[model samples]
Target chain A: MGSSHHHHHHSSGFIDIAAFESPLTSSASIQQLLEHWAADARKEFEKALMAVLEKEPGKRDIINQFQTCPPEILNKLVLRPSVVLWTTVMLQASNGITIHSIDGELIAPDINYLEELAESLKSPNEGVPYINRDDLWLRLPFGQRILFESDEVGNIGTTIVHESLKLIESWRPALLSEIITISPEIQFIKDPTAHPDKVVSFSDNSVPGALYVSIRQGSRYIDQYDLADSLIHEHRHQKLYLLQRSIPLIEIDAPLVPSPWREDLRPPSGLLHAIFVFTHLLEFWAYLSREGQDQIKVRAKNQVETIRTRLLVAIPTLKRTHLTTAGREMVEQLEELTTNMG
Target chain B: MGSSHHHHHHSSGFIDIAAFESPLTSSASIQQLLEHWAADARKEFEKALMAVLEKEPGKRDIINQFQTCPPEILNKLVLRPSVVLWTTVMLQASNGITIHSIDGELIAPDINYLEELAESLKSPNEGVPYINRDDLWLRLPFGQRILFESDEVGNIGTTIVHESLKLIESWRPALLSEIITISPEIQFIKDPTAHPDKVVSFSDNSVPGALYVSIRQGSRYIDQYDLADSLIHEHRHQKLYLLQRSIPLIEIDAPLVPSPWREDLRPPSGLLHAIFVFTHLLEFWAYLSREGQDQIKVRAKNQVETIRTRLLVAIPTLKRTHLTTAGREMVEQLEELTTNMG
Candidate 1:
């Protein structure tokens, strides 16, 4: 074992900081950094988890079991937001620290059935359960799970998912692939009272690698394009969450300020996230406005106009908020992209 | 405390991944990311160290002492490579893991004086000691310390350090400041039997924040320009080490390949590091060749030409090595920069 150890030195993957000089300018570098960020986040959580487990003799067996699993299986399972958050909570508890707000935000299939989760790991066979429309849920091209919340799956069926996927796929496969890589799971929540033309969608840092969109249960009015908008919007949030774990864009003690996009005053971090997602959203619409067919073109143009106007207000708001060096760079990029999209 | 926790939400600094999109293109973004990387590394080690200390009640008080220290002081102290590596060693030992090679590489004032070092933290005082030239050593503009290894300063005096600092500072203050930030300590080791014209310098990832240079005793021929070259060379290694922790440029199982730069077959990582540092070195010399006076201009041009010709061969060799997406971007950036430099 000792003699073989010399080989390990060369195996530790390395990168020159010089590569960082142009990460954002090149599509490949952006994609690579996002993937690397996710992997690093998972590794950090595992380190925290193993440390927590070592203190509990009973839980120590779980670590051994975890190690026994194939690297691919283990890697996939651990990155699941539930596993990452659960481990975070466990480590915090071991250290006598508690995060109260996040405790409630973590919804069902959360931390209640840990032993059951561990048992299932021994013979892993299933994808994430879609409590509603379990039979209809399917994997998208880049491996994101499309799950429906209601059993009926009337308005939000396979058609919308396929069309929405195609919408982004046809226009920008690279962006679509990046979205899928960043957020591997999507759940369409059954919103009985949702507006016919609008979808409410969000991605939370607390539940990373997952995004949710609210749709009317039995109405056929949800536009595939709007669904596409929601997908890319939420994808930006998830992507930013992974990045925030690394390069912080806002000052730690940033103050709340008036936001042009949101109704209420928000922190610099929230404003940055808003500007980031909306800028990409604007780009998506601007592309379709220039390229899509008659009515679709008109709708995209309208969206592009609306977002462009809002960003005109929001971009300035973002600039006013105190930002870190990275934050300022983001603002500059958003400003430049917005101007060009116009 | 629970209600106040909502405030905690806004305070967690965030950055949109959009910022990452253009990190390398702008000088401010690159500088920001590098600083952020160091902070994150220190935070990770502290987390690991705290976890290890938690299990040992007798040693747990050290954690309390550590936590009580001011944030600025704590941040600076934790980043010292010795502290980072020592905490890593302790955490590995607790996990029943060991790295034999790393154990030997860690030299004096390593883990042995940990408790005494911790004791000093209670009432912190003084900077790092210079065993040699105890009275003559001075701090550089950007806060890097200049120290000597032996009691007798000999031929490598305050003049060399000051002149070398001036050489870099005058040409590129940003790059020089970066070197100082990345490597805060420089030690000149006296070699009684050594060449007059050459100075050997290196920075080790294992001992980040420090660089070493070897100079012949009673020798006056070592040029400040050579010293400046060495400073940037070692700084690149240290900078790359930090970046590697976050964005991996090489594949984990990358194959060793033929190199145009070095005689020995090197892994993709070693190759990338070599190319990265040397390209910057080429830039430094090329700048001086065009900008400097007298014999300096001639010598700089010769150095630049040699490196230029070598990279013409090395760049192609780099492309053949197995590289990750980030690695390929790095290669492209290096290639473009090399071409432009020529």
Candidate 2:
């Protein structure tokens, strides 16, 4: 079995009075003087150790002493810590790995100092860039205000807020003002046992001038990052809502994919599913960025399989009822996306 | 403060025609039928309850169809079973006490079995009991051993051999017969880690055939038990040894009183302290049996105070210590009889 082991030893051998007391205490002479002190220390250490041995009579005094003594002192005196040292050395030697500790002083960041620095940077004139409302509005279609709302499903509200703020901050100085305001609205319903899978968002036609996004608390199976991805996916819907009213106008009702249909007709529904799948693909990209590339494929693959099973049962039932065209299209798009991605 | 309540009410208003039409229907009058059916099942009984409120929507239907429904249907229709019912009801209500279903089942042992039946008899046959020779011999005075041979320390080899066997068996039955033989003549060196509060047991010249028991495990702290009650406290040591003889007995030792005598003592040292306190007083009856009643009282009172402090520390250290020492003395005597009687 492959295992990692760390051994800590503690011991201080007999003090070398002469070495520290010598006239040549400079760095140049310290190394040479330490060797002589080491020999003297070992001699005194062995003598003291033997005293315990003689008094112990028939008992294996040295062995018992080693077992009872703390590892720090043992390491300094005996050149070997404890049995733990041997076990660790054996494992490392067998694996042909040599581990070394970095010799340096480490400093932990002072949060208060960092917070003060951040406060200074928040000023518009401070050298750091800031975002304004018009700049953010220009990013959307036709300069329409888009409101995003999400049910804090799966305990993702805190993470989602942090990531979303960071994304907004990265394009600050110019877009800071246009970003308007962000706040979490908590809705406490009498029934807390709502199953997490249901997704509900406002249609583009619901409001003429503004894009309103409302997401139902989705399944608890999806974690913070996945919920963040879902939030982004819904944000994409707001972009589509604005896009439909932009100059060089395209009358696309559904976001992500261009279409006007219900669950029965396949285009918008298929496209919605595809966009949802792609949003997760983007999330995998984000995951790799945050956690490292090695974890990306594994996490993305698991998400794909999970979504597939859920949609499989849902899609058939929707088809049997000849549900809305957009819903059907969403499922089709999702299936196609997974096929392509895999 | 806004909360949307969704209560899923499942009640059918219409009566089932099947109940009246079934071939197995009883010819009893409606009043008799109502009483008989309602008394037999919870669902049927609930139906009768709802019948009183016929004007309530769905009440009449539930009552009429209750008897005709299958068992599974009835099971679901009734209140769901809850292990936390008692706690929940108590939390919600103010006045009444709720007794659980399990409270009545463990009242008494059945007497039909021979051993149980025999316990109830007022008097039993008085018969000759066979005693093992080895046990009888070991219980005899140390100076009266048949093959006694003294070592350099003046301890008898024969007595040590007999006592060792008894101690080993008393501590753990699993180790019984594992000791080949002990020869006190061999003059083994003493273990410094052994209990220091050595106890010597001997009978006076007036009782020449009586035995004296002396124990030397190291420190008094090595003796500990969960219960402070005398008999159980000692039995814990025996039980602990039996279960973990291969483990170093010294490791099982507990700390004694923090007097000068115990200053150099190490953990786990409280066991002896615990045992010493219990044996001296908590179990004053047995010690009083051997030592006179006054000595038992003085020893018990003194040890009780010492043990109380040691126990306060030991109990926290060993969290598994039982809260109560009820019947500890009785249990100790019974266990002692089990090992010594045969």
Q: List the residue pairs that clash in candidate 1.
A: A21-B24, A22-B24, A24-B21, A24-B22
Considering summed lDDT, which 10 consecutive residues are worst modelled in model 2 chain B?
Answer: B4-13
Best by TM-score: 1
> Model 1, A1-342: lDDT tens per residue?
001111112111122222222223335544565566547655655665566466555666666666677766766666665555555445544443332221111121123235555776765464342212322111111011223455556434446766877888888776666765567766665333444455666555545676666555345546788878887887787766655656667664322344666434355577677788888888889879888878898888889888888788777756754466777777887788789763
Report lDDT per candidate: 0.57, 0.28
Which 10 residues in a row give candidate 2 chain A its minimum summed lDDT?
Answer: A4-13
Question: On a 0 to 1 TM-score scale, where does candidate 1 land against the true structure?
Answer: 0.42
Instruction: Write one digit per residue (lDDT tens) for candidate 1, span B1-342.
Output: 000111113111122222232223335544565567557766666766565556555666566666677777776676665555555445544443332231122111123234654775876655332212322111111012223455345334445766877888788776666665567666675333344454666555545666666544344445688877877787777766655666676654222444565433444577677788888888889889988887899899899989888888778756754466777777887787789887
